[PDB]
Design an enzyme around this catalytic site. Sequence first.
Site, PDB file in Angstrom:
ATOM      1  N   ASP A 113     -32.119 -17.601  13.669  1.00 35.31           N
ATOM      2  CA  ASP A 113     -32.949 -18.725  13.252  1.00 35.31           C
ATOM      3  C   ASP A 113     -32.844 -19.884  14.247  1.00 35.31           C
ATOM      4  O   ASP A 113     -31.746 -20.299  14.633  1.00 35.31           O
ATOM      5  CB  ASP A 113     -32.543 -19.159  11.844  1.00 35.31           C
TER       6      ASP A 113
ATOM      7  N   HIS B  75     -38.411 -19.467  12.907  1.00 32.40           N
ATOM      8  CA  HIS B  75     -38.037 -20.430  11.872  1.00 32.40           C
ATOM      9  C   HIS B  75     -39.167 -20.516  10.862  1.00 32.40           C
ATOM     10  O   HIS B  75     -40.298 -20.869  11.236  1.00 32.40           O
ATOM     11  CB  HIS B  75     -37.753 -21.809  12.465  1.00 32.40           C
TER      12      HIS B  75
ATOM     13  N   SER C 223     -37.121 -23.511   5.098  1.00 37.23           N
ATOM     14  CA  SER C 223     -36.137 -24.381   5.760  1.00 37.23           C
ATOM     15  C   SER C 223     -35.409 -25.247   4.729  1.00 37.23           C
ATOM     16  O   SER C 223     -34.743 -24.686   3.855  1.00 37.23           O
ATOM     17  CB  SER C 223     -36.768 -25.190   6.914  1.00 37.23           C
TER      18      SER C 223
HETATM   19  C1  LIG Z   1     -30.894 -27.059   5.275  1.00 37.00           C
HETATM   20  N1  LIG Z   1     -31.254 -26.995   6.680  1.00 37.00           N
HETATM   21  C2  LIG Z   1     -32.555 -26.032   6.863  1.00 37.00           C
HETATM   22  C3  LIG Z   1     -32.594 -25.802   8.206  1.00 37.00           C
HETATM   23  C4  LIG Z   1     -31.130 -25.999   8.704  1.00 37.00           C
HETATM   24  C5  LIG Z   1     -30.337 -26.317   7.370  1.00 37.00           C
HETATM   25  C6  LIG Z   1     -29.040 -27.136   7.604  1.00 37.00           C
HETATM   26  C7  LIG Z   1     -27.859 -26.652   7.146  1.00 37.00           C
HETATM   27  C8  LIG Z   1     -26.715 -27.354   7.334  1.00 37.00           C
HETATM   28  C9  LIG Z   1     -26.750 -28.568   8.002  1.00 37.00           C
HETATM   29  N2  LIG Z   1     -27.930 -29.052   8.457  1.00 37.00           N
HETATM   30  C10 LIG Z   1     -29.075 -28.352   8.266  1.00 37.00           C
END
Ligand SMILES: CN1CCC[C@H]1c1cccnc1
Length: 355
Positions: A253, A298, A145
């Site tokens: 996801d 996820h 993540s």
């Molecule tokens: C970096 N995060 C990991 C999970 C979602 C992702 C993300 C990408 C863009 C904006 N917010 C979150």
Amino acid sequence: DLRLHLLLNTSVTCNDGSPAGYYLKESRGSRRWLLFLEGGWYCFNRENCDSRYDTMRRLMSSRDWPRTRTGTGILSSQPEENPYWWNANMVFIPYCSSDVWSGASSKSEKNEYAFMGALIIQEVVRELLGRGLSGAKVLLLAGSSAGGTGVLLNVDRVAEQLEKLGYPAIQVRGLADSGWFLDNKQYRHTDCVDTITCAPTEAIRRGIRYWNGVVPERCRRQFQEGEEWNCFFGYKVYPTLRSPVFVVQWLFDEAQLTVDNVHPVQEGLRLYIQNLGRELRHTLKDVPASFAPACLSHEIIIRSHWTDVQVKGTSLPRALHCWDRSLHDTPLKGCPVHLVDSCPWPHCNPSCPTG
Ligand SMILES: CN1CCC[C@H]1c1cccnc1
Ligand SMILES: *[C@@H]1O[C@H](CO)[C@@H](O)[C@H](O)[C@H]1NC(C)=O
């Protein structure tokens, strides 16, 4: 078990100024090192960082971290749980900077929170060089993540760091799990009236300013000042990377649905889901090494059941093993490295995780 080490340079800190650190399990006689970046969202202004500090404090502070951690999935040292790299030196880097591993801003009279994720990675690498990393053959920077996006943002800086420090023999590679997202599914891209409904690209734009966030140099040079948020999106930052990076990405996801404000499904939702899988598959078409199952889930790589998911008959540990073979100093017979499901709906792959 992996044993906690708090950074000797206590100026490289978690959000609240407590020392950052890493969990380490050494494997003498292995020259492979796995550095795993933990995930767990982020915060992007004083008010939602304060909320995170109240009920997600382990993601902002080392004060309550346990002395040890059990390595699971790709961090397991048992070949049954980890057919890929069970004999590797294992490092788990806890996520306590709330900045998608991009920050380079310490606490002061002006900053009540420190955002030092990019500096924490560099400091862990520096300390590990004195604990055997100087002899490594491969350093695999992995992450899930926010840690997966962290890999994309940091893998080339680790490679450059090791080159400038005089260790050109160490091959730096990346493994990004659930870190590959799309920014195109928004009605509005700039509105941010509250934290929960803030547009994903706007949240990242605000975060970068709040964190003094840094992005890879070749990507920054393309998008230029003010547009660094682009480099948080895999399909934009990936073509700029020099290090080999393996991309693990569920086609549907759960965090993609969350940033798209998507929760008997009717035509509108069915079209969103089917289009999302097609668009993700399209962005991976030119990624050489990838594993992208048609599942609603996820993260995967530190889950004990990561051995069980298969794409076109090939497990994730096997795909990573084939990737290793492909990079040893023409595709391999029966050892594929690019594994992306073509079926169009969650759980059309029978090996998807359950619950
Ligand atoms: C970096 N995060 C990991 C999970 C979602 C992702 C993300 C990408 C863009 C904006 N917010 C979150
Ligand atoms: C500690 O880390 C900071 C930030 O990278 C650096 O400026 C400083 O020189 C380091 N000090 C020591 C003693 O390692």
